[PDB]
Amino acid sequence: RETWGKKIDFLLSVVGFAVDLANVWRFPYLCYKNGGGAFLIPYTLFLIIAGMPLFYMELALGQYNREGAATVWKICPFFKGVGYAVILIALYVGFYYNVIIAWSLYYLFSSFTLNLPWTDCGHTWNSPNCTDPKLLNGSVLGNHTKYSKYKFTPAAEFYERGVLHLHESSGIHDIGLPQWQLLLCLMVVVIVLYFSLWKGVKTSGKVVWITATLPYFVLFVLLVHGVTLPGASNGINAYLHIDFYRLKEATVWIDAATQIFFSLGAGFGVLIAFASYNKFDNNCYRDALLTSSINCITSFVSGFAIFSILGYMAHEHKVNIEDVATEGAGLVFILYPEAISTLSGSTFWAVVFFVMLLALGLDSSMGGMEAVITGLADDFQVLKRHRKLFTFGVTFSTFLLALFCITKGGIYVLTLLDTFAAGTSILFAVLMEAIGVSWFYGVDRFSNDIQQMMGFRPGLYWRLCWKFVSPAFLLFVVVVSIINFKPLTYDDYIFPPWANWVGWGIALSSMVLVPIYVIYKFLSTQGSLWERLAYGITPENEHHLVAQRDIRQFQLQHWLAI
Amino acid sequence: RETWGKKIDFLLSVVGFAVDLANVWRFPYLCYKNGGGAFLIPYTLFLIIAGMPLFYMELALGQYNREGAATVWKICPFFKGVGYAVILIALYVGFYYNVIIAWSLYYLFSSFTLNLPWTDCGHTWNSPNCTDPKLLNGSVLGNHTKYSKYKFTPAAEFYERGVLHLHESSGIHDIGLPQWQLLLCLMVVVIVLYFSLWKGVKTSGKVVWITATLPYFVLFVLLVHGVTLPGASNGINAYLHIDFYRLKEATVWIDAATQIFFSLGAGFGVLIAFASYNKFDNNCYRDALLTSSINCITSFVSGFAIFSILGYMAHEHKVNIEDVATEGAGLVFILYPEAISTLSGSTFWAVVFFVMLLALGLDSSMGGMEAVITGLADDFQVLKRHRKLFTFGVTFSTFLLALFCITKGGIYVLTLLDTFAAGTSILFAVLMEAIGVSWFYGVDRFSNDIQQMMGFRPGLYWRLCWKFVSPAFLLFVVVVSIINFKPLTYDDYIFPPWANWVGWGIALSSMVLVPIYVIYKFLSTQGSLWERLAYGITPENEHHLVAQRDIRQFQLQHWLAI
Ligand SMILES: CCCCCCCCCC(=O)O[C@H](COC(=O)CCCCCCCC)COP(=O)(O)OC[C@@H](O)CO
Ligand SMILES: CCCCCCCCCC(=O)O[C@H](COC(=O)CCCCCCCC)COP(=O)(O)OC[C@@H](O)CO
Ligand SMILES: Fc1ccc(C(OCCN2CCN(CCCc3ccccc3)CC2)c2ccc(F)cc2)cc1
Ligand SMILES: Fc1ccc(C(OCCN2CCN(CCCc3ccccc3)CC2)c2ccc(F)cc2)cc1
Ligand SMILES: CC(C)CCC[C@@H](C)[C@H]1CC[C@H]2[C@@H]3CC=C4C[C@@H](O)CC[C@]4(C)[C@H]3CC[C@]12C
Ligand SMILES: CC(C)CCC[C@@H](C)[C@H]1CC[C@H]2[C@@H]3CC=C4C[C@@H](O)CC[C@]4(C)[C@H]3CC[C@]12C
Ligand SMILES: CC(C)CCC[C@@H](C)[C@H]1CC[C@H]2[C@@H]3CC=C4C[C@@H](O)CC[C@]4(C)[C@H]3CC[C@]12C
Ligand SMILES: CC(C)CCC[C@@H](C)[C@H]1CC[C@H]2[C@@H]3CC=C4C[C@@H](O)CC[C@]4(C)[C@H]3CC[C@]12C
Ligand SMILES: CC(C)CCC[C@@H](C)[C@H]1CC[C@H]2[C@@H]3CC=C4C[C@@H](O)CC[C@]4(C)[C@H]3CC[C@]12C
Ligand SMILES: CC(C)CCC[C@@H](C)[C@H]1CC[C@H]2[C@@H]3CC=C4C[C@@H](O)CC[C@]4(C)[C@H]3CC[C@]12C
Ligand SMILES: CC(C)CCC[C@@H](C)[C@H]1CC[C@H]2[C@@H]3CC=C4C[C@@H](O)CC[C@]4(C)[C@H]3CC[C@]12C
Ligand SMILES: CC(C)CCC[C@@H](C)[C@H]1CC[C@H]2[C@@H]3CC=C4C[C@@H](O)CC[C@]4(C)[C@H]3CC[C@]12C
Ligand SMILES: CC(C)CCC[C@@H](C)[C@H]1CC[C@H]2[C@@H]3CC=C4C[C@@H](O)CC[C@]4(C)[C@H]3CC[C@]12C
Ligand SMILES: CC(C)CCC[C@@H](C)[C@H]1CC[C@H]2[C@@H]3CC=C4C[C@@H](O)CC[C@]4(C)[C@H]3CC[C@]12C
Ligand SMILES: CC(C)CCC[C@@H](C)[C@H]1CC[C@H]2[C@@H]3CC=C4C[C@@H](O)CC[C@]4(C)[C@H]3CC[C@]12C
Ligand SMILES: CC(C)CCC[C@@H](C)[C@H]1CC[C@H]2[C@@H]3CC=C4C[C@@H](O)CC[C@]4(C)[C@H]3CC[C@]12C
Ligand SMILES: CC(C)CCC[C@@H](C)[C@H]1CC[C@H]2[C@@H]3CC=C4C[C@@H](O)CC[C@]4(C)[C@H]3CC[C@]12C
Ligand SMILES: CC(C)CCC[C@@H](C)[C@H]1CC[C@H]2[C@@H]3CC=C4C[C@@H](O)CC[C@]4(C)[C@H]3CC[C@]12C
């Protein structure tokens, strides 16, 4: 197998893997929806007890097995159907992650102008209900009209109408035809993606070089700008005020878990595919610690900047912080452009920011496509030779199925995918992974593999998390997601029940791949129930132990190792 | 390869292969839409000059090459991308052919009653605009209300509302959710289909035994009943009156060509897959002659019976024959039930008729699925071993993509598929087949293969048709289909332009597989333009002639063989 170059394997190169479109695009609106401040505690908790242990586990498993997402379950076949699951999950993510890049690409085409289109009203897409904060002298409708989401701001008008053209659709039932601008943007995105995958894993490149310094620089500039804005202090106070009533709810914990899994990459097969090309002496412990710490710091500073910009916009518009902006996937494309417009030389900063989030999106999607391709090629060796045609077909299918999110009402389908395709499905997938690694495979064998790879055994904390803490918390979040499910709703649009049923069906498409595979493995195995179960719960390299009637899983000492 | 049993290879067993769901379901409404009588002349012409020559050609090619639909182009690789085309075409057919069986299945569940649901009004699905011919004494709205399609008859009300529930949808944009009755019907259909394919080709069975006597018996009974009905004579006169103004149009010729290709099976890969399991001495000439003759006779008698029933219904309803019934895929499910209701013991005859058309549908769909599976297995030998899982996946995908036609507005999608998926696409496919066989491969080699298989060379007529007549007529019908395309319309519902664009895109999906494949073959071949073209236009067993610089296609004597 291939090996990552020394440029990407450097000690200071973990910062590149510690930022993602999720940390800059998903975290902001996920924290704003949960109030802010009350979301950091569940986020940090799931990071320290669930996110980082699963991160370390997936890294060690991918480094030891040298396999893809699904084939890494060569130690326990009954669980190979869960690998496919996360693979599909990753694919589902692409079905809308690439649509996001296209958005930024359009913003890039909107960034090479002296007057930014989101600065003021008066354009073609601007509706009569467009109130610019600097045009209070005219008072067409006033800076403050109503407080539900305030979608009448120039940035919101440019995003919903000038980019997505949501005004030409009333729901998910009448999305219509895809916009040709977004069509060309997604075409360029998938073209750049194809020629960035087709020759296998890229050990090092400009993509992984610019995503390590540009995101941090942009975030620092945005923080320095926001801390000196009028009204920004109010947003800071709203971000450092923890409402424990929100903690009493279950949605906050689900959002925190999903954001942790998106930022760290657990539950998509990216970590295993990445570790499959690492060295045998790579210290996954230090990598996991640094990744978790940098991700937590980045999320904290990003939420702080987002709330500062929200307070600034609330002061400029004379609206409440909870109703000044939306709570959808387009929150950053409304807060960040207006913040850049206030800085001196808005054109240059906007261009830099759009190049940055476009690069971050491309690296995030590449990683996902490479994980999917690596898994399917380790499953089918024909792909290891037909890489070019396989990547072409994967990108073409992703483009075809993403044509839905570049439609006039495509934001609804994008929210549906971001809520159901990678919602309870990824939680069930990582729960099955933890159960198959800590209970079926056993924590002792995993600790021995870690000791023979990195030279030390994990402490009691890591093993107790892998075996007891993380599986229990994953089961708990799955239960509170299934029982306490809330109907999916947009800023003001309410999804019909059939949309929720379609979302649940999409989630079950990935969820039931674990049971379906156990059935397939049981029927395809020749022998009695004992032999079938033994072949299903034992590694492929120890199937001879089935003949010797010596199975560790059939002993009480295996399940009580701890 | 497998061989068909002597039961299906009998001389009198061609009658089973001479009837299809198309001859009993598609021909009737295709002839009624074109007026009747003016449709028989183009039908017979395309049968004698285009249908039968292509039938014989495909039979001989499948018997000589012993390959599937796509692999049969081992004599000319540049044309293998057209095989896939017809394969996809066949799959497209299934996407709605199976939905038809389900319909009949529902009618079966409606046939085990003393009072047929389509006899009179007064049920739940019956709308207030339901006029029964026997209830003229009450005169709710009169036997004659308006003359566009007269969808107010009890049979039409039971079909559109009681079965399809079209009243709960206004177009193709608001089809809604699939009916659970049609859902269970399609589930039973695909279950019967899976266990009828999973063990490979069935040499002989009850399915191919009952479809040889029951269709002819049912048609004879229907003819004897219709020739003794009031008003039936008027329909006979309307069927034997040829309107040459219709012949001046182009739609009639296109419909005749499509119906010929549906009835004979040319353009789907079924003929090649069938001949791949025949004997080396099987006389395809006699088979083609008998098939064409029996198909023509069956189409004639079916149209006669359909027009007799139409005249009877027009007399009973006091409406015009051109407006007494619809012109869609549900014409037979309105004419035949009312005709059975008039016969003594309507329950038994209805049960027999529904068992017959359900069996005919199952045999027609089986043939198609077996052709697709045989082609894809000759392309990928892994399927020759994984037949079970491959058939399961194919049936599951067909069920998923047919869930669209069992929706409230699923008849619109079914008409769209029946008009565009197997419209100009199959014409272009058979044109490319004729060009690749008669011009690229050469009529002399094909005649020599026929002579070495059956012991005689084809006459001048067959070769002139394969080389000049049939390709020219196929090009002509393709031209009149593309240039003189008419917007697709239902009985009263008009499809929006985007529906026509989606239909054209679906057709192009199959059409452009020929060009895309020539590009793929050209890039995957290593060598200069001369060597690439030689490897692309020469059989796989003669590629050594490329090294000797002796290619027949590069000589004028090859293209001027005649
Ligand atoms: C939403 C309902 C889908 C039900 C469709 C259910 C088929 C189940 C076959 C199955 O499970 O076989 C796999 C290999 O097959 C695959 O690719 C992935 C199959 C997963 C299909 C999910 C597609 C979802 C869009 C397992 O094969 P294997 O025995 O582990 O290895 C065979 C070879 O791939 C490598 O050895
Ligand atoms: C609507 C746009 C689709 C563009 C998608 C374009 C890929 C083109 C690959 C291609 O053309 O490779 C084929 C084998 O691949 C296949 O299966 C069928 C491929 C056709 C895909 C059509 C799917 C339509 C729903 C030819 O492979 P081969 O070199 O003849 O033989 C390889 C092996 O199958 C047997 O030798
Ligand atoms: F094989 C690999 C090759 C490259 C990478 C890179 O990672 C990309 C960074 N994110 C990717 C996926 N994120 C969340 C998943 C969302 C998603 C999106 C689209 C489709 C499916 C899922 C987590 C991390 C990388 C970048 C710097 C680096 F130093 C090392 C690796 C990973 C694996
Ligand atoms: F491999 C084979 C095995 C069996 C058959 C049987 O033919 C079925 C009879 N029709 C099938 C297809 N029709 C039109 C296509 C429409 C269609 C429908 C669904 C999906 C795709 C396309 C033409 C003929 C058969 C029956 C009696 C017999 F004696 C011999 C063969 C054929 C090939
Ligand atoms: C085709 C294969 C790859 C699977 C595709 C899975 C995803 C992309 C599918 C599964 C169910 C689909 C949805 C089903 C129904 C609707 C409602 C319609 O008014 C707009 C499209 C929309 C919202 C679809 C979008 C795409 C969708 C989410
Ligand atoms: C199976 C997947 C991977 C590939 C094939 C996907 C095809 C069938 C899907 C993907 C997205 C779809 C499009 C999405 C939205 C619209 C706009 C609507 O007003 C007409 C149909 C149209 C134009 C769809 C046509 C079919 C389409 C192109
Ligand atoms: C091959 C099949 C399965 C999928 C085809 C996908 C592609 C070719 C189709 C699907 C939806 C289509 C788009 C639907 C609507 C519009 C808006 C209008 O400006 C015409 C072009 C444009 C932008 C179409 C371009 C082609 C398109 C992107
Ligand atoms: C609708 C569009 C955007 C879908 C994506 C199409 C992409 C994946 C396709 C379109 C044309 C293709 C190219 C056509 C020909 C060649 C030359 C060959 O020697 C290597 C592959 C290469 C370079 C192909 C790569 C994939 C490709 C770029
Ligand atoms: C020789 C051994 C390794 C068998 C190789 C078979 C491989 C090439 C086959 C078997 C399973 C196949 C996959 C099964 C299902 C799907 C989903 C579909 O939406 C796109 C094609 C795709 C992704 C197939 C691609 C080809 C595939 C990977
Ligand atoms: C659903 C839409 C997006 C179309 C997707 C088409 C994909 C799944 C198809 C199209 C062409 C196919 C390839 C054609 C030929 C080969 C060579 C064979 O030795 C291994 C499989 C491989 C490499 C196929 C893999 C699957 C493939 C890439
Ligand atoms: C209910 C449907 C829609 C989803 C689940 C279907 C599963 C349970 C079925 C569908 C097709 C089945 C396979 C069909 C044929 C074979 C070959 C033989 O070795 C027996 C097992 C095996 C490999 C089956 C395993 C179970 C299977 C994969
Ligand atoms: C998914 C893969 C197998 C390809 C599927 C091809 C066929 C079945 C697809 C291609 C384009 C599709 C159509 C695109 C758009 C619409 C309009 C919508 O209001 C109802 C469904 C309907 C009418 C779709 C029905 C299914 C369809 C005809
Ligand atoms: C790629 C193909 C072969 C397999 C996957 C097809 C899936 C994605 C398609 C096929 C038919 C589709 C369904 C057709 C119609 C409806 C009714 C509508 O009110 C909600 C969506 C719903 C319920 C669709 C959901 C998605 C669906 C199930
Ligand atoms: C796995 C994904 C890709 C496809 C899922 C397809 C199946 C499971 C889905 C697609 C559309 C669904 C149907 C849509 C609507 C109805 C009507 C109502 O009575 C509820 C059940 C019923 C009848 C659903 C049953 C399940 C269904 C048939
Ligand atoms: C929604 C439904 C109707 C889709 C179709 C599902 C069909 C194809 C699936 C569902 C369950 C499957 C069966 C499950 C298990 C077995 C036992 C095995 O020893 C042979 C295959 C066999 C007999 C499978 C055949 C295919 C099968 C019947
Ligand atoms: C070892 C050699 C023969 C290669 C074998 C690869 C075979 C098994 C692969 C390569 C091409 C693949 C097909 C490519 C595309 C599609 C269309 C998709 O909608 C369903 C899966 C399907 C139909 C794939 C099934 C598996 C497939 C046939
Ligand atoms: C799109 C919807 C309907 C799902 C379709 C799934 C189909 C294409 C998939 C699901 C499971 C797949 C099979 C899984 C495993 C194998 C064994 C391998 O050695 C050859 C390919 C083969 C036989 C695959 C062929 C394609 C397959 C049947
Ligand atoms: C424009 C798009 C959407 C449709 C047509 C794409 C065609 C022309 C492209 C897409 C991917 C391409 C393939 C990608 C890679 C290879 C491998 C190498 O041997 C060169 C040719 C070959 C085999 C290409 C042939 C042409 C190809 C099949």
Curated annotation (Swiss-Prot), chains A, B:
Result, substituting residue 498 to A: Decreased homodimerization and norepinephrine transport
MF annotations from Gene Ontology: actin binding; alpha-tubulin binding; beta-tubulin binding; dopamine:sodium symporter activity; metal ion binding; monoamine transmembrane transporter activity; neurotransmitter transmembrane transporter activity; neurotransmitter:sodium symporter activity
Description of activity control: Inhibited by mazindol, desipramine, nomifensine and nortriptyline.
Ranges facing Extracellular side: 34-37, 112-178, 228-251, 308-347, 410, 491-493
Consequence of changing residue 268 to A: Loss of norepinephrine binding. Abolishes norepinephrine uptake
Effect caused by changing residue 80 to A: Decreased homodimerization and norepinephrine transport
Positions with a binding annotation for dopamine 1: 20, 90, 262
Other facts noted in the record for this chain: This protein is the target of psychomotor stimulants such as amphetamines or cocaine.
Protein name per Swiss-Prot or TrEMBL: Sodium-dependent noradrenaline transporter
Source organism per UniProt: Homo sapiens
